[PDB]
């Protein structure tokens, strides 16, 4: 079968599932940005922009 380092090559001839894999990557990255911001807001002290 495909070696572990080639599993995503099933997408090369499959534009629809490539687009799906891209959408998922995009979902993960936007989800990261969202989560990262909320974690920063939950920990950020806005009381002193000077020091």
């Amino acid at each position: 079968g495909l070696p572990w380092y080639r599993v995503h090559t099933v997408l090369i001839n499959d534009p629809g599932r490539l687009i799906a894999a891209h959408l998922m990557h995009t979902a993960l990255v936007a989800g990261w940005a969202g989560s990262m911001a909320l974690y920063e807001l939950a920990t950020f002290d806005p009381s002193d922009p000077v020091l």
Binding site: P46, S47, D48, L51
Partner: protein, 121 residues
Amino acid sequence: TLTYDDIVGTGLANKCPTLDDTARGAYPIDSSQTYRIARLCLQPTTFLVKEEPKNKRQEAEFVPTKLVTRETTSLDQIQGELKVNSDGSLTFVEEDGIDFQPVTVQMAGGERIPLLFTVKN
């Protein structure tokens, strides 16, 4: 000239009475008579809280806040003696009334600041 039912739930019950723009006269003080304030009303429109900055140096400023306890803030039905002093100054000495309200306001960023808004004594 409104009844309870005209007022109930409008927010008007937390507002002090007002006077028309024409009320720019003069109320005579007869040094011989005794006087009273039969009704004092105080209606806050702004609560400011002094910030506590990290180094004393730079004066700390009073900053605006958000009221979270609704239209429950006014002092009213307050009464007491209005003395005429030797020098013709008047001294109000509060005897009684609804002379305190607990109030919570909120600083930018969410910190809540409860206070007993009062003119007791």
